[PDB]
mmCIF file of C-alpha atoms and ligand atoms in Angstrom:
data_model
loop_
_atom_site.group_PDB
_atom_site.id
_atom_site.type_symbol
_atom_site.label_atom_id
_atom_site.label_comp_id
_atom_site.label_asym_id
_atom_site.label_seq_id
_atom_site.Cartn_x
_atom_site.Cartn_y
_atom_site.Cartn_z
ATOM 1 C CA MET J 1 -0.508 -8.634 -12.974
ATOM 2 C CA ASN J 2 -2.983 -7.827 -10.189
ATOM 3 C CA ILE J 3 -3.004 -6.005 -6.804
ATOM 4 C CA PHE J 4 -1.367 -8.942 -5.047
ATOM 5 C CA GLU J 5 1.539 -9.288 -7.486
ATOM 6 C CA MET J 6 1.914 -5.463 -7.507
ATOM 7 C CA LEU J 7 2.168 -5.088 -3.729
ATOM 8 C CA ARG J 8 4.483 -8.148 -3.506
ATOM 9 C CA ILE J 9 6.884 -6.352 -5.884
ATOM 10 C CA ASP J 10 6.555 -3.103 -3.911
ATOM 11 C CA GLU J 11 6.779 -4.567 -0.417
ATOM 12 C CA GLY J 12 8.976 -7.644 -0.841
ATOM 13 C CA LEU J 13 8.745 -10.590 1.572
ATOM 14 C CA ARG J 14 10.717 -10.954 4.801
ATOM 15 C CA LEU J 15 9.966 -13.738 7.285
ATOM 16 C CA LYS J 16 11.671 -12.148 10.258
ATOM 17 C CA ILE J 17 10.733 -8.837 11.932
ATOM 18 C CA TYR J 18 12.358 -5.906 10.069
ATOM 19 C CA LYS J 19 12.186 -2.126 10.014
ATOM 20 C CA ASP J 20 10.265 -0.567 7.110
ATOM 21 C CA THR J 21 11.369 2.540 5.177
ATOM 22 C CA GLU J 22 10.146 4.731 8.065
ATOM 23 C CA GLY J 23 11.969 2.629 10.666
ATOM 24 C CA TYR J 24 8.848 0.853 11.983
ATOM 25 C CA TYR J 25 8.788 -2.819 12.957
ATOM 26 C CA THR J 26 7.195 -4.773 10.152
ATOM 27 C CA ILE J 27 6.910 -8.373 8.978
ATOM 28 C CA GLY J 28 5.935 -10.432 5.923
ATOM 29 C CA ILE J 29 4.705 -8.457 2.924
ATOM 30 C CA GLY J 30 4.745 -4.970 4.421
ATOM 31 C CA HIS J 31 2.626 -5.910 7.431
ATOM 32 C CA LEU J 32 3.234 -3.055 9.938
ATOM 33 C CA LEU J 33 3.394 -4.341 13.519
ATOM 34 C CA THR J 34 3.817 -1.234 15.645
ATOM 35 C CA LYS J 35 5.241 2.253 15.428
ATOM 36 C CA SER J 36 6.767 1.724 18.864
ATOM 37 C CA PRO J 37 10.608 1.559 19.127
ATOM 38 C CA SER J 38 10.353 -1.616 21.208
ATOM 39 C CA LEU J 39 11.170 -4.920 19.531
ATOM 40 C CA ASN J 40 9.336 -6.533 22.445
ATOM 41 C CA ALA J 41 6.198 -4.625 21.637
ATOM 42 C CA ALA J 42 6.631 -5.758 17.966
ATOM 43 C CA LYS J 43 7.075 -9.420 18.943
ATOM 44 C CA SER J 44 3.926 -9.160 21.058
ATOM 45 C CA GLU J 45 1.840 -7.620 18.201
ATOM 46 C CA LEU J 46 3.233 -10.356 15.940
ATOM 47 C CA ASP J 47 2.206 -13.214 18.236
ATOM 48 C CA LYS J 48 -1.270 -11.654 18.544
ATOM 49 C CA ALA J 49 -1.474 -11.202 14.744
ATOM 50 C CA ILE J 50 -0.491 -14.835 14.085
ATOM 51 C CA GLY J 51 -2.130 -16.501 17.128
ATOM 52 C CA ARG J 52 0.991 -18.294 18.380
ATOM 53 C CA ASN J 53 4.335 -17.701 20.025
ATOM 54 C CA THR J 54 6.478 -16.751 17.071
ATOM 55 C CA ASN J 55 9.674 -15.245 18.504
ATOM 56 C CA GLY J 56 9.830 -12.835 15.535
ATOM 57 C CA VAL J 57 9.774 -15.415 12.766
ATOM 58 C CA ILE J 58 6.792 -16.533 10.639
ATOM 59 C CA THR J 59 6.323 -18.922 7.777
ATOM 60 C CA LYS J 60 5.568 -18.021 4.181
ATOM 61 C CA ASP J 61 1.935 -19.216 4.534
ATOM 62 C CA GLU J 62 1.540 -16.959 7.592
ATOM 63 C CA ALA J 63 3.012 -13.979 5.703
ATOM 64 C CA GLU J 64 0.603 -14.551 2.834
ATOM 65 C CA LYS J 65 -2.300 -14.850 5.239
ATOM 66 C CA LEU J 66 -1.546 -11.456 6.788
ATOM 67 C CA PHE J 67 -1.095 -10.085 3.259
ATOM 68 C CA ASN J 68 -4.524 -11.336 2.180
ATOM 69 C CA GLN J 69 -6.062 -9.705 5.258
ATOM 70 C CA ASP J 70 -4.239 -6.411 4.661
ATOM 71 C CA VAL J 71 -5.255 -6.183 0.986
ATOM 72 C CA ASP J 72 -8.845 -6.976 2.036
ATOM 73 C CA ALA J 73 -8.626 -4.261 4.728
ATOM 74 C CA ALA J 74 -7.198 -1.695 2.279
ATOM 75 C CA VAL J 75 -10.177 -2.336 -0.089
ATOM 76 C CA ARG J 76 -12.618 -2.123 2.856
ATOM 77 C CA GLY J 77 -11.095 1.212 3.963
ATOM 78 C CA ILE J 78 -11.536 2.686 0.477
ATOM 79 C CA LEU J 79 -15.196 1.570 0.234
ATOM 80 C CA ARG J 80 -15.970 2.913 3.719
ATOM 81 C CA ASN J 81 -14.324 6.309 3.095
ATOM 82 C CA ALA J 82 -16.450 9.148 1.661
ATOM 83 C CA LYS J 83 -13.501 10.657 -0.199
ATOM 84 C CA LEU J 84 -12.003 7.410 -1.494
ATOM 85 C CA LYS J 85 -15.071 5.431 -2.534
ATOM 86 C CA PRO J 86 -16.299 7.698 -5.368
ATOM 87 C CA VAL J 87 -12.787 7.883 -6.800
ATOM 88 C CA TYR J 88 -12.324 4.103 -6.729
ATOM 89 C CA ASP J 89 -15.803 3.534 -8.300
ATOM 90 C CA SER J 90 -14.882 5.937 -11.139
ATOM 91 C CA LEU J 91 -11.619 4.112 -11.989
ATOM 92 C CA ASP J 92 -10.874 1.203 -14.312
ATOM 93 C CA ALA J 93 -9.480 -2.016 -12.841
ATOM 94 C CA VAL J 94 -5.765 -1.207 -13.203
ATOM 95 C CA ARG J 95 -6.004 2.272 -11.672
ATOM 96 C CA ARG J 96 -8.133 0.812 -8.851
ATOM 97 C CA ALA J 97 -5.106 -1.344 -7.982
ATOM 98 C CA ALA J 98 -2.945 1.803 -7.802
ATOM 99 C CA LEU J 99 -5.343 3.332 -5.304
ATOM 100 C CA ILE J 100 -5.337 0.147 -3.185
ATOM 101 C CA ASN J 101 -1.520 0.201 -3.286
ATOM 102 C CA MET J 102 -1.460 3.769 -1.840
ATOM 103 C CA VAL J 103 -3.968 2.887 0.960
ATOM 104 C CA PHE J 104 -2.021 -0.257 1.818
ATOM 105 C CA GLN J 105 1.146 1.857 2.135
ATOM 106 C CA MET J 106 -0.088 4.922 3.920
ATOM 107 C CA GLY J 107 -3.579 4.126 5.242
ATOM 108 C CA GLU J 108 -7.028 5.427 4.313
ATOM 109 C CA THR J 109 -6.579 8.735 6.157
ATOM 110 C CA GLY J 110 -3.240 9.470 4.497
ATOM 111 C CA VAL J 111 -4.626 8.859 1.008
ATOM 112 C CA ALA J 112 -7.891 10.785 1.736
ATOM 113 C CA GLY J 113 -5.523 13.738 2.286
ATOM 114 C CA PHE J 114 -4.616 13.790 -1.419
ATOM 115 C CA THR J 115 -7.757 15.894 -2.102
ATOM 116 C CA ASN J 116 -6.551 17.571 -5.286
ATOM 117 C CA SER J 117 -5.036 14.373 -6.789
ATOM 118 C CA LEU J 118 -8.212 12.427 -6.042
ATOM 119 C CA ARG J 119 -10.308 15.084 -7.755
ATOM 120 C CA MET J 120 -8.057 14.961 -10.840
ATOM 121 C CA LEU J 121 -8.203 11.158 -10.829
ATOM 122 C CA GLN J 122 -12.019 11.242 -10.697
ATOM 123 C CA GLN J 123 -12.000 13.725 -13.639
ATOM 124 C CA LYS J 124 -9.577 11.428 -15.556
ATOM 125 C CA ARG J 125 -6.999 14.220 -15.945
ATOM 126 C CA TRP J 126 -4.219 11.614 -15.722
ATOM 127 C CA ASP J 127 -1.128 13.726 -16.560
ATOM 128 C CA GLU J 128 -2.239 16.410 -14.115
ATOM 129 C CA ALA J 129 -2.996 13.920 -11.289
ATOM 130 C CA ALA J 130 0.437 12.383 -11.838
ATOM 131 C CA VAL J 131 2.128 15.806 -11.451
ATOM 132 C CA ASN J 132 0.087 16.545 -8.281
ATOM 133 C CA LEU J 133 0.655 13.040 -6.790
ATOM 134 C CA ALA J 134 4.434 13.659 -7.039
ATOM 135 C CA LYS J 135 4.342 16.825 -4.930
ATOM 136 C CA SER J 136 4.185 14.853 -1.722
ATOM 137 C CA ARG J 137 6.249 13.564 1.151
ATOM 138 C CA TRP J 138 5.244 10.131 -0.185
ATOM 139 C CA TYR J 139 7.035 10.702 -3.501
ATOM 140 C CA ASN J 140 10.141 12.308 -1.948
ATOM 141 C CA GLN J 141 10.630 9.500 0.648
ATOM 142 C CA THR J 142 9.927 6.506 -1.617
ATOM 143 C CA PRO J 143 10.415 7.844 -5.172
ATOM 144 C CA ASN J 144 10.892 4.517 -7.000
ATOM 145 C CA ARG J 145 7.750 2.950 -5.568
ATOM 146 C CA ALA J 146 5.750 6.172 -5.881
ATOM 147 C CA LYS J 147 6.838 6.576 -9.555
ATOM 148 C CA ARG J 148 5.578 3.020 -10.314
ATOM 149 C CA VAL J 149 2.205 3.783 -8.675
ATOM 150 C CA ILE J 150 1.970 7.208 -10.347
ATOM 151 C CA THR J 151 2.785 5.663 -13.769
ATOM 152 C CA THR J 152 -0.021 3.153 -13.232
ATOM 153 C CA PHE J 153 -2.458 6.045 -12.556
ATOM 154 C CA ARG J 154 -1.140 7.965 -15.562
ATOM 155 C CA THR J 155 -1.293 5.143 -18.144
ATOM 156 C CA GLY J 156 -3.803 2.646 -16.791
ATOM 157 C CA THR J 157 -1.402 -0.163 -17.738
ATOM 158 C CA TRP J 158 1.032 -2.376 -15.767
ATOM 159 C CA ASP J 159 4.082 -1.183 -17.696
ATOM 160 C CA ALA J 160 5.941 0.092 -14.597
ATOM 161 C CA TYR J 161 5.699 -3.439 -13.116
ATOM 162 C CA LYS J 162 6.703 -5.458 -16.194
HETATM 163 CL CL1 LIG V 201 -3.461 -8.350 12.269
HETATM 164 CL CL1 LIG V 202 10.839 3.520 -3.297
#
């Protein structure tokens, strides 16, 4: 297992524009297009993202290309962020993937807001971080996904994904 296989399980793959769990237009492997209620705005962000006139449908290669870029961007956002970088640097390789998964889902700013959890993660107080991570809108809106990510932080293994 690695970050790619993990996020592919968590996000799925859809080749036509769809609404994510928050109701936002999305494509591919959780690639958010726009928070705007307009499908036309979404189609326009999609064409711009892909570089061709898509009419709301992309190929598998194209979905995986956006996915590669988004994973890359999630990593870059962690390393650029003063609150996220030291936590990531402190973590082993499996728990690093859990942090990338959170940033991919909710963005660098959203994750940087988990001040107390991040501190516990840095201190390697795994059971405590896991309890604090769960007291969140994130956990109450997407409990199954959040539980898998939290379990990864708690155990440092891929057991929730196997
Ligand atoms: Cl893009
Ligand atoms: Cl979920």
